[PDB]
Amino acid sequence: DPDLEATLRAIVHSATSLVDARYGAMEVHDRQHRVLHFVYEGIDEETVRRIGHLPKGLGVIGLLIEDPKPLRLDDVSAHPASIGFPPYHPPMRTFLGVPVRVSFGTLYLTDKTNGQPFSDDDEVLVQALAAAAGIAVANA
Amino acid sequence: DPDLEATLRAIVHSATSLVDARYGAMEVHDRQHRVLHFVYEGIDEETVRRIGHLPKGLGVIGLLIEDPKPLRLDDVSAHPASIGFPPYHPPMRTFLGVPVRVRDESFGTLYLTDKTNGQPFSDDDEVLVQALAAAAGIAVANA
Ligand code: HEM
Ligand code: HEM
Numbered sequence: 001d002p003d004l005e006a007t008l009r010a011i012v013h014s015a016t017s018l019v020d021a022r023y024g025a026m027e028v029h030d031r032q033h034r035v036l037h038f039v040y041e042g043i044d045e046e047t048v049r050r051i052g053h054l055p056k057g058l059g060v061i062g063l064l065i066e067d068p069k070p071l072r073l074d075d076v077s078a079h080p081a082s083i084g085f086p087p088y089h090p091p092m093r094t095f096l097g098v099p100v101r102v103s104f105g106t107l108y109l110t111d112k113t114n115g116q117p118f119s120d121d122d123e124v125l126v127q128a129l130a131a132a133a134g135i136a137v138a139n140a
Numbered sequence: 141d142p143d144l145e146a147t148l149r150a151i152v153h154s155a156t157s158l159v160d161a162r163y164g165a166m167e168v169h170d171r172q173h174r175v176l177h178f179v180y181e182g183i184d185e186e187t188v189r190r191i192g193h194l195p196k197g198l199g200v201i202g203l204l205i206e207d208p209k210p211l212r213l214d215d216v217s218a219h220p221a222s223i224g225f226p227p228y229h230p231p232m233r234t235f236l237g238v239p240v241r242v243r244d245e246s247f248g249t250l251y252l253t254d255k256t257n258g259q260p261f262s263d264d265d266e267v268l269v270q271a272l273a274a275a276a277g278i279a280v281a282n283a
Contacts, residue, residue: 003242003281007274014271018264125268128154132275135147139279 004140008039008133012107015129016041019122021109023092028105028137033057033065037105043090050088059083060095064106068099070127072118076110094118098130102138106130141177144283149179151276155252156181158272159265162254163232166240168247168280173197173205177248183230190228199223200235201249208239208246210270212261216253236261238269242277250276 008026016024023042029035038054057065063081064071073079076095085091092110096118100107107130112118118126148166156164165180175197180188197205203221204211213219216235225231232253240248250273255261 003278006243007278010274011271014267018267125158128158129268129271131154132151132272135151136275136278139147139282 001140004136005037005039007136008037009041011129011133011136012039012041015107015109015126018125018129019096019109019118020113021096021118022111022113023090024107024109026100026105026107026133027055027057027061027065028100029057029065033062047088047090051086052088053086060097061106061108064097064099064108068101068103068106070096070098070123072096072123074117096123096126098123098127100130100133100137102131102134104134104137107133141283144279145177145179147279148177148276149181151272151279152179152181152250155250155269155272158268159236159252159261160256161236161252161261162256163230164250164252166248166250166276167195167197167201167205168240169197169205171245173202187228187230191226192228193226200237201251204237204239204249204251205246208241208249210239210266211235211237212266214260234260236265236269238266238273240273240276240280242274242281245281247277247280 012024012026025040028037059082073095075093097108152164152166163182167175168177169175213235215233234255235253237251239246
């Protein structure tokens, strides 16, 4: 649906630019937790091709899907639910993930470019953007 | 449509909180540019009654409908398209307006005034309100 995905991309781009994240993404899933939409920013096509397949919603991704609550991490790979990055996936450290809610999905940002953890303010802002995304999906 | 207006009100409420505006509103119009929905935040019911009539889409409101582009102003009443506030309408100075759009159609405008720090709205404020407006566009388009 060209509607929703233009909007979801715009929302991801705004979140990423507003909190100075190097990477940003959003997954939307059905109530069976199968990923329906995956939108992303900050990774070029050549790298996407190397990774080769879309996230299935595992590790910390799957964690946010099954228990949709905001999560900020200094190091996502140190979370005990972490599964690891697949081959050619850029390594990422700092992490901010918030549910797309009215819960249909997750908005997540990584590697704030100052090397610092994401802030409280960052989380409030991105949560509002995810809420906006929730409205867009719910109404699509 | 109370469903659609509840949604639009939530988006306005979010925008107003996020950019620290004293007032926030959204109009939706048809292709004749007749206002179909108007939702707002920061003005109480007694004052609304006193204003006495809903915006028709004139002055700077009408400017955004007629030319749907993002617009920030230090003083809305100084814009050459300004018509002035009606009686009992709170005076407003700083202004941020963005189209509620989807593709080959712009259906409305999200606007914020009087940022509470007394400052003009920022580049960041506009980026943020644009994203919320895009969400509103989907809600409108799908109603
Ligand atoms: C650019 C924004 C992106 C962000 C912020 C992001 C974030 C993450 C994070 C933090 C993990 C670790 C999960 C864990 O260790 O538990 C992960 C895993 C994974 N990522 Fe990404 N990623 C992005 C882009 C992409 C792209 C473009 C692809 C594929 C084309 C991809 C495919 C995968 C896959 C297959 C996994 C394994 C877990 C799963 O399948 O759900 N990612 N991602
Ligand atoms: C609370 C958020 C509100 C904002 C941000 C806002 C903002 C504005 C702005 C920027 C103008 C243009 C001024 C000019 O051209 O000089 C205007 C005019 C106007 N306003 Fe509002 N206003 C709000 C609430 C309301 C309410 C609650 C009413 C009535 C129920 C109302 C009725 C009108 C009318 C009738 C005009 C004359 C232009 C027209 O008819 O479109 N406003 N306002």
